[PDB]
Amino acid sequence: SSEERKERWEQGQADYMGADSFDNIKRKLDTYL
Amino acid sequence: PGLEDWEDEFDLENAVLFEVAWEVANKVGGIYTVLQTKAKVTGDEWGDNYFLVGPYTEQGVRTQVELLEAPTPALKRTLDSMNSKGCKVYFGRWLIEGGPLVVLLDVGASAWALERWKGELWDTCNIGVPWYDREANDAVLFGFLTTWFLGEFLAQSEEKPHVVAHFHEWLAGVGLCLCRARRLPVATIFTTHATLLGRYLCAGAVDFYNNLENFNVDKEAGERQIYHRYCMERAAAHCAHVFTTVSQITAIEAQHLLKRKPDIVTPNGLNVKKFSAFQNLHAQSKARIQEFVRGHFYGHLDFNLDKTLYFFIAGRYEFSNKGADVFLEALARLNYLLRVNGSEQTVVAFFIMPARTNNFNVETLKGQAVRKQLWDTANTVKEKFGRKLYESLLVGSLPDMNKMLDKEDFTMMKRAIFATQRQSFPPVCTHNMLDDSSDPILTTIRRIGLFNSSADRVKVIFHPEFLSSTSPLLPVDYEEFVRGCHLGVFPSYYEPWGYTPAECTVMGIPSISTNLSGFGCFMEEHIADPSAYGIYILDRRFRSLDDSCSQLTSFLYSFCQQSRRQRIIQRNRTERLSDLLDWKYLGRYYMSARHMALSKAFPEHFTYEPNEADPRPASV
Numbered sequence A: 001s002s003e004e005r006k007e008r009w010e011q012g013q014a015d016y017m018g019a020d021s022f023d024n025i026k027r028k029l030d031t032y033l
Numbered sequence B: 001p002g003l004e005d006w007e008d009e010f011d012l013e014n015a016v017l018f019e020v021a022w023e024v025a026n027k028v029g030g031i032y033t034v035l036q037t038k039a040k041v042t043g044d045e046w047g048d049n050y051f052l053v054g055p056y057t058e059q060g061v062r063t064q065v066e067l068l069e070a071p072t073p074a075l076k077r078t079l080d081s082m083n084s085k086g087c088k089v090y091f092g093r094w095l096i097e098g099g100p101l102v103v104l105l106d107v108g109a110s111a112w113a114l115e116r117w118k119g120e121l122w123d124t125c126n127i128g129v130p131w132y133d134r135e136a137n138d139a140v141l142f143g144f145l146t147t148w149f150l151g152e153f154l155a156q157s158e159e160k161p162h163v164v165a166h167f168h169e170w171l172a173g174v175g176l177c178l179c180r181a182r183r184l185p186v187a188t189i190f191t192t193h194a195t196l197l198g199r200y201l202c203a204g205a206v207d208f209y210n211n212l213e214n215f216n217v218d219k220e221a222g223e224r225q226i227y228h229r230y231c232m233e234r235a236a237a238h239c240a241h242v243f244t245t246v247s248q249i250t251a252i253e254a255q256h257l258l259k260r261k262p263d264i265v266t267p268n269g270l271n272v273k274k275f276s277a278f279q280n281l282h283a284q285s286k287a288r289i290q291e292f293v294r295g296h297f298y299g300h301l302d303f304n305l306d307k308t309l310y311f312f313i314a315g316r317y318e319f320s321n322k323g324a325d326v327f328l329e330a331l332a333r334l335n336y337l338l339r340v341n342g343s344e345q346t347v348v349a350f351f352i353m354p355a356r357t358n359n360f361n362v363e364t365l366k367g368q369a370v371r372k373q374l375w376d377t378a379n380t381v382k383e384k385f386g387r388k389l390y391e392s393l394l395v396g397s398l399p400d401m402n403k404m405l406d407k408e409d410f411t412m413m414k415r416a417i418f419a420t421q422r423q424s425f426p427p428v429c430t431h432n433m434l435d436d437s438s439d440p441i442l443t444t445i446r447r448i449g450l451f452n453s454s455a456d457r458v459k460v461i462f463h464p465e466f467l468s469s470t471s472p473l474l475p476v477d478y479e480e481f482v483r484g485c486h487l488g489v490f491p492s493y494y495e496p497w498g499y500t501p502a503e504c505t506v507m508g509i510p511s512i513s514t515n516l517s518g519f520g521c522f523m524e525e526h527i528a529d530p531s532a533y534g535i536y537i538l539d540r541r542f543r544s545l546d547d548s549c550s551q552l553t554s555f556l557y558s559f560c561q562q563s564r565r566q567r568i569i570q571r572n573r574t575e576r577l578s579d580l581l582d583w584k585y586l587g588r589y590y591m592s593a594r595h596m597a598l599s600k601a602f603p604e605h606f607t608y609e610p611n612e613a614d615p616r617p618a619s620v
Ligand SMILES: O=P(O)(O)OC[C@@H]1O[C@@H](O)[C@H](O)[C@H](O)[C@H]1O
Pocket: B278
């Protein structure tokens, strides 16, 4: 949740099955267009 | 024929375009030449509104960048604020053919802001960058400075013009993502020349081209620790007003990998004027290659040199990507076929691929020195014979042919003759391998059994070193040597676009490519009956390896069976094909992409009619 996910981002352990999949980035990005 | 000012008459008014790319004024890859060639025509269309955004390098600015003062007060104030806010940005010209305006951004002068910029990037798109990449951080900094420069330029202008941003590669996609994030009134174009995961998946994984729909890109990005690079690449591709690709194969690759069909395909072109400086050059090059093969094959010249064909394959040392194994196997099969049929033709294959060598071998230098000595002795004897014949012929007497040779002439001829004695066979490579045990090309040659024997009808020459005009044995550049060859075979497997086959074809040499490259698909789509124009497409997508090899063998055998008149006609047809690959025609697709971008960004002021009109049916 937020900060710990951010940490896992810089150290590079991405839970790409769940929260670190590109789908979340898609639903966050699509609002700007 | 078809010029830029054919049908796109459009109110451009106060529009500025930014050609953002990480490699501008910094030679790194191959699309450097693409930008350098496109700059002239794009600036001619755009006047003085063409800018390039790229990182600063001391070597590049020292060698090919001339610093100058920006012509507008807006650039003056933006540069002053940019330098006064803690960064370091310079201005100047690019010393190339077109001479476009360039802004250079020093990524090393903004290391203080990376900590806050990473946090803002994460809060904007949830994109994280590991600390050990040393390249993605540079891309992030380049994008942040690019978007900040664009925002300052649009904000500080007294009257706001229509700004167009054009990015080229994922080291610059962060800029597109950020400018779309901050809702700047900009038209964004994203063009990709090569998918990131394509190169990773072609190596190691099998049948990458038969499993596009069965690839869940997230994991394959995951295990290779290239997840974040794919993330930013795909995010930049998604949030683009117009998405563009360089070739059809890359179009399907992006569609099945980036999950977005590209709106327009833009092939890469080149300027044909410089290459054109057309049979005299080929004849000279063929004769001098004959000189080289005479030098290499001293003591075993038992085959006619008027019926010998020269094949060649060049490019970076990728055994699988360039398909050299297929070429070698098909050469072995063709040697078998020619030996069975008892043909007088001979095939000499050249392999120009860089390797890890130290020096030349003794045999090649010995052969070249022997050839030089023979040539010198022949010249001396022929000069003496001509002088004697002239003097004896002025007095009106027939030459007593048994007295034109004296003791020293016989001595020189004898010395040459004992110089041309050799018991071994000519070597297959002209250098000394440092990894001869682990070399794939030599291992394949040994397995297929081509040792330049007397009975062999196919000769293999491997030339690892870069081809230079100062070479001791081949003092020639790439262009002149390629001009003299007979055929260029490129059985490539993975290549987004073929620069080397394009250079071969624009030169006027018949070439063999695959339906698996951008150049092959482009040629197949834009002409009918491609075999008549000297281009043979190998079907590699819908066929197995053994099928691809048999087809290539059949193509080579058909080429070898052609008569001299047929070869001349085919060569003239391939000569009259260079104008299809010039920016005078290929530059229209980029222009259409720009018009799409302006239509999407500002529909109130601009409206585009979707005209996709653009041809060589046949010649026999
Ligand atoms: O007599 P022209 O119509 O000018 O043609 C002469 C042409 O000049 C150059 O373009 C080339 O040498 C051509 O091979 C030649 O045909």
